[PDB]
């Protein structure tokens, strides 16, 4: 398609997978991960690798996959074995980080963050709704501010 | 309605029409020609607008 938008009404606000380096932040590199790791979304630590949330029992949410500004242009995706190979999966696991939320989400500040623990394109998306489909609580994480469409900056109190 | 701005629409014709040299197989002349075009490169989805029915 020609481009996403000819003219934007207002500057789009801080895409997902971003950590603000003012507050105490920590983004920890994980050497092995899953192909197609959709950045800007909650990623679990399973069998010693970072991977997309799916219908697991109690996934160890390792944080939010960081968005690389100087990565491959395209869908925000961690991809192995290509010209756009990503060697290591930067995962934001402490501080304020932006995460894509569902379209149904209207999460006010300090609501507990829930991630869609489903095996689909909605995997690892934050939400307010504790009763959404495949919603799984994220321990000590709360919504903070509303960034660009469907992207909420959340706060991870402890290390995720 | 469309924007004739360079940054809105371009007409991409990377290679203009080239004609081959004349081929003479005895008394059978033959000329072939080609051109390479990308067509209308619309750069913005909302750089024009349509009215259907008028």
């Amino acid at each position: 398609m020609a481009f996403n938008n000819a003219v934007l009404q207002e500057v789009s606000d801080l895409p997902a997978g971003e950590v603000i380096k003012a507050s105490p932040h920590n983004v920890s590199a994980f050497e092995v991960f899953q192909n197609g790791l959709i950045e800007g979304r909650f990623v679990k630590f399973d069998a010693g690798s970072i991977d997309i949330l799916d219908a697991s029992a109690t996934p160890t949410i390792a944080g939010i996959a960081k968005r690389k500004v100087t990565g491959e242009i395209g869908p925000g995706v961690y991809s192995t074995s290509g010209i756009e190979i990503d060697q290591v999966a930067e995962v934001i696991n402490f501080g304020f980080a932006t995460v894509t939320v569902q379209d149904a989400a209207a999460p006010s500040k300090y609501d507990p963050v829930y991630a869609i623990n489903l095996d689909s394109a909605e995997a690892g998306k934050a939400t307010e709704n504790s009763g959404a489909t495949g919603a799984l609580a994220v321990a000590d994480c709360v919504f903070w501010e509303q960034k660009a469409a469907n992207v909420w900056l959340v706060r991870m109190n402890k290390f995720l | 309605a469309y924007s004739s701005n360079r940054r809105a629409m371009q007409m991409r014709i990377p290679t203009p029409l080239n004609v081959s040299s004349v081929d003479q197989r005895g008394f059978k002349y033959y000329v072939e020609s080609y051109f390479g075009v990308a067509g209308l490169d619309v750069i913005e989805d909302t750089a024009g607008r349509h009215l259907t029915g008028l």
Binding site: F3, A6, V7, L8, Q9, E10 | R6, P14
Partner: peptide, 24 residues
């Protein structure tokens, strides 16, 4: 097998600068 031209040379990158435009 395939061809002799790797993909990145068959695809051309335009030098023109395209600046994103916002409301006036």
């Amino acid at each position: 097998e395939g061809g002799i031209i790797l993909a990145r040379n068959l695809e051309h990158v335009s030098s023109e600068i395209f600046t994103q435009e916002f409301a006036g």
